[PDB]
Amino acid sequence: NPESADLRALAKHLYDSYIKSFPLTKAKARAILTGKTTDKSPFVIYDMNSLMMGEDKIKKEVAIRIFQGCQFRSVEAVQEITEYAKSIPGFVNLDLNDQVTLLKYGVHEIIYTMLASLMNKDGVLISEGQGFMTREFLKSLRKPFGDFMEPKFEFAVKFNALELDDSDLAIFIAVIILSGDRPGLLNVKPIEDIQDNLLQALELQLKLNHPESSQLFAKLLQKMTDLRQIVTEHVQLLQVIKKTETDMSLHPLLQEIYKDL
Amino acid sequence: ESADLRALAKHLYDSYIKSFPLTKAKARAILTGKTTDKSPFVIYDMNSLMMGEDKIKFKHITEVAIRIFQGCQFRSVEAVQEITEYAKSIPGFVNLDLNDQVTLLKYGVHEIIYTMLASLMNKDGVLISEGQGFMTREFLKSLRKPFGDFMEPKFEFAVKFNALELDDSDLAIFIAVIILSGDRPGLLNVKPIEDIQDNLLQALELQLKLNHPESSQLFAKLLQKMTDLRQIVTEHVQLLQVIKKTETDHPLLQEIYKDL
């Protein structure tokens, strides 16, 4: 069909921009985690000793240092997601204020989606897959900090059972950015016309790439409720840390995103 | 077979008509709708409330914001039994582990109540007492410090949910998809729940394609609204624990309602 064909070209375009925007793809993450010979095995951090050994190999309190580590990686992800968003057709043509709103609300939902790529049951890849930090070591951190990652692992284990690949995820993250139910949006209709087109492209991609996977489209859109709950839970955890650690700085970029969310 | 999807759509519509007295078609006729054969009594004010209690026979009723809250709770307890009856008509539901049926109802009913509340709302108010009354959004915002923003978030949800222009035949399937959620906590056997929710999502997809052929990606937009339902529900429960810190200290009344 002429219309299918425009949907495949949109899918190829977004996958292309996704590869160019995100240095560590799920395909590379899965090669490192499942020990494929295409990639180097990571140094594993499971305790204080392996952590300090990590400083040497992969290149102030421990819970805090790991937390600032996450923080900076989040800032980097925000920069890669903002560069991907510019590639989404129509996005840069929107009201500048709506561009800002779509990024502010969308970026955390995208971070937890793509963070699932780097996770299994037992832990998470770090320093572009040169390291692996165990889930158990993260859960054993000091009182406020030991709970930060657990909800991300729980989402990730469920999300990964969908067995999406990068070409699926490129279209899904574009659908997330182009919501239009986000608060404070000036012109909802230009946003929903783009989301509509992205949702058509996602639906055909999943039919073609997962022809045996019944209602994968609906099952993936339902996962949007889990992303919203991880974001809401994470923000109220940051409100606790702000108050118990008055000496701990937050990046302004993260601060501007969380501002009246 | 697309015919077997048309079967459970029909079946769910028939059962939804039997379970829920005030359908969206009826609510709409009375609201923004004209159908001027019997206009609702409007509650806009303290004296409208007091007169309303007089005109409409209210089944609840032995401060003003407390008595409205109690009336809403009474309606919720009735809606739970209507939804429970509807659930038992969904193919496969009664064959699930009984603990899993109870779990699915326990977590589902709140999401269904707000879904169905939207049928009875416009941007200016909510229908009550089976469509015989109408409580204004302004009057509900006007109420005391905690009770003034219990209904507001549901109005904002309803305005947005109602823009989809679903009818009863669409909503009947949507409500079933909500109930058969495999992600409720403490479920013992997720497989048969996800397998029924699969079949229901197929039926809802086909229903929205046939019932709304010019409404692009309605299915996606409706599934996205489930994200908003969960937020409303989590936001509502936290507001409820503050209300359990004003209307403190009947014992048998306490029991009938409960958080459970």
Ligand SMILES: O=C(O)c1nn(Cc2ccc(Cl)c(Cl)c2)c(=O)c2cc(Oc3ccccc3)ccc12
């Ligand atoms: O740089 C990373 O990729 C990184 N990632 N994660 C998980 C994660 C979180 C958020 C996002 Cl968006 C991504 Cl993609 C990945 C960390 O938890 C993490 C922790 C760090 O702390 C230390 C500190 C001293 C030694 C060793 C590690 C350092 C770096 C990281």
Ligand SMILES: O=C(O)c1nn(Cc2ccc(Cl)c(Cl)c2)c(=O)c2cc(Oc3ccccc3)ccc12
């Ligand atoms: O009985 C009703 O229909 C009713 N409904 N709602 C909204 C609602 C809630 C849940 C569900 Cl599922 C639905 Cl579908 C609709 C109320 O808020 C409400 C408030 C009341 O308060 C008073 C008290 C004294 C006088 C006048 C009104 C009385 C009755 C009601």
